[PDB]
Amino acid sequence: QATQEVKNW
Amino acid sequence: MIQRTPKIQVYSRHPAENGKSNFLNCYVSGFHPSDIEVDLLKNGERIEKVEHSDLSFSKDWSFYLLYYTEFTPTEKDEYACRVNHVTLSQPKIVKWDRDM
Amino acid sequence: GSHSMRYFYTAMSRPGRGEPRFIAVGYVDDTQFVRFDSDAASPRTEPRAPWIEQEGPEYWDRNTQIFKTNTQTYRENLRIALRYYNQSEAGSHIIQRMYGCDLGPDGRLLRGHDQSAYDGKDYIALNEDLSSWTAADTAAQITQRKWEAARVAEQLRAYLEGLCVEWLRRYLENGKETLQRADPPKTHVTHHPVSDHEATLRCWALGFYPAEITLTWQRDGEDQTQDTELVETRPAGDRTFQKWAAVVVPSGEEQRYTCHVQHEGLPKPLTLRWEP
């Protein structure tokens, strides 16, 4: 199960 | 840009036996960037129905792909893999050697 | 044995050829189980191992939403990276990410991972504490400061210690007949004369899973590392792997050489020699 991205670079 | 040229191995899934169906593999690895052209050849001509794995990469960020097709080896038919990549000035052809 | 889960993301810009492509693949150990490709006719998370197929529609929808959002996020990250490196909009560039969890033999978390790269070079990595970052350069330090301000590490720690481990354990159980089965190598030595006074001995390992293996040649009981040609472990296409190691030896000295094989499917390491 993948995780969501939290913030851009 | 810092680029890495592909390593290439050409080999069969199972030990080759003439007249017995098998799979011909061309494993390309160690390359960066990811765009790459791979053909499998039978007597110098491109094999039409070739599949490949989904793009992934190693711990050093270099990419790898497996290209493969069903084949029935014989004594006389020659097989090879032909690879093009931005790091190559001409396509690299690696012949299938059943001992490697 | 020990087990791991990893996701691998690749985002590749291609100015003049549409928006950047995003590909994600997921592995348990050396077994791929999902893929997503933004260039597919209908981008969605797709199964790549039989034991994942039983997950219900909520699983497929949740993961597809993640990867569709990530397609957009990594297009933005590629634009940001151009600013951070003073680069033009004309070139093609790649972001990669790899993250996931490792379990020890008792199923306990050993450690988590989350690392990213730009153009094939390390960019930023979550430290083993799951609380701080290592930036590779002054560009990645900008991202580090942004992620510190937003407490990103705390969210990643919560995933890596929680959902990552829970889902890996579930996959290991559902796929136990394959994921928890080691296939030992089938081994043999071949002999290839190279001239009247030397021959190649090649030690083969075939049909093994997982991919980790050690193959070494000794001469008179001393490792021959500098003199051994060792090919990269390679996939057979049936889940298993292959490897060989070769030495060139003086004709008449073949019995002084022994090949040694270590693999988790073997109860004891093997010693082999050429058997004419």
Residue numbers in the entry:
A (entry chain C): 1 to 9
B (entry chain B): 0 to 99
C (entry chain A): 1 to 276
What did the study's authors say about this model?
One such highly networked epitope associated with control is QW9 (QASQEVKNW, HIV-1 p24gag residues 176-184). QW9 can be presented by the disease-protective HLA-B*5701 (hereafter B57), but also by the typically disease-neutral HLA-B*5301 (hereafter B53). Here we examine the CTL response to QW9, a highly networked epitope presented by the disease-protective HLA-B57 and disease-neutral HLA-B53. To explore the molecular underpinnings of differential cross-recognition of QW9 and QW9_S3T restricted by the two HLAs, we next determined the crystal structures of QW9-B53, QW9_S3T-B53, QW9-B57 and QW9_S3T-B57.
The substitution of serine with threonine in the QW9_S3T mutant provides an extra methyl group that is absent in the QW9, resulting in a substantial change in peptide presentation by B53. The changes are not caused by crystal packing. Figure 3e overlays the structure of QW9_S3T-B53 with that of QW9-B53. The biggest change is QW9 residue K7QW9 flipping from being buried in QW9-B53 to being exposed in QW9_S3T-B53. Since the position of HLA residue Y99B53 is fixed by a hydrogen bond to the amide group of T3QW9_S3T, the distances from the OH group of the Y99B53 sidechain to Cα, Cβ and Cγ atoms of T3QW9_S3T are only 4.1 Å, 4.4 Å and 3.8 Å, respectively. It is thus reasonable to postulate that the bulky HLA residue Y99B53 pushes the sidechain of the bound mutant peptide T3QW9_S3T upward, consequently forcing E5QW9_S3T to rotate away. The carboxyl group of E5QW9_S3T is stabilized by a salt-bridge to R97B53 and hydrogen bonds to two water molecules, W2 and W3, while the flipped K7QW9_S3T is stabilized by extensive hydrophobic contacts from the α2 helix of B53 to K7QW9_S3T. The electron density map clearly defines the protruding sidechain of K7QW9_S3T. In B53, E5QW9_S3T is tightly sandwiched between R97B53 and N70B53, meanwhile, N70B53 is tightly sandwiched between E5QW9_S3T and I66B53. The N70S mutation in B53 indeed increased the melting temperature (Tm) by 10 °C when bound to QW9_S3T, indicating that N70B53 is a critical destabilizing factor for QW9_S3T presentation by B53.
